[PDB]
Amino acid sequence: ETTDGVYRVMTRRLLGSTQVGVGVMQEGVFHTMWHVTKGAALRSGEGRLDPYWGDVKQDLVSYCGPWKLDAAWDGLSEVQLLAVPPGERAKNIQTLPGIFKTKDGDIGAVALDYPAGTSGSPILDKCGRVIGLYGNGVVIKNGSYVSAITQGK
C-alpha cells in the first residue's frame, strides 16, 4: 500500500498491537516524525519501506524518497488537525494556530492534546494541503499540550 493518505504506525514488540504514531503518504514517500520510528524501517503488507532522509533536530523522517510536503500556514486562516488516535477513528479538529517564537523565526502551533501515539498526524489548510505534522511541542503552565506545526523543506 502506497496510496496517498494518512496511515497508522503500529508495532508488536509490546503488549498486542500498539499504535506508536501516525504518518502521511504522498507521491510514493511516507512522511512521519523521527521520534515515532527512530529511523527504523517499516513494513506495508508485503513490502518494506526503508528510510531515505531524516533529521533529529527537525524531528522528521521520510521513507522511500525525499520529503514531498511543502505547504505552509498562510498564518491567517484556521487549520485542521487530522488526528488518528490509537484505537480510534481519524477525526478532523479545526483550530486557529498560535506561535512558537524561536531565535530563527516563528512556527505555527496547535493547542491540541491527544494521546502520545497520535504523533505524526497531519495538519491541513482549508484547500487540503498538508502543512505540517503534529507531535513535537511543549507543556504549558496549565499542564496540557501545545504542538508545533512541523514541516520539512
Binding site: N92, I140, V146
Partner: protein, 38 residues
C-alpha cells in the same frame, strides 16, 4: 519491527469540531529536537 496500516484520506472537514486557543510561547529548539519553554 514496525508496520503501517492506512487510516483515512487527507481532506478538510467542513463539519469539524472547533477547539483550542492560539497562544504565543517563547520556546527553544535544542540539538535533540525537544522544544523547551523560555
Amino acid at each position: 519491527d514496525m508496520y503501517i496500516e492506512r487510516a483515512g484520506d487527507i481532506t478538510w472537514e467542513k463539519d469539524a469540531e472547533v477547539t483550542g486557543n492560539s497562544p504565543r510561547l517563547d520556546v527553544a529548539l535544542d540539538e535533540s529536537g525537544d522544544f523547551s519553554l523560555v
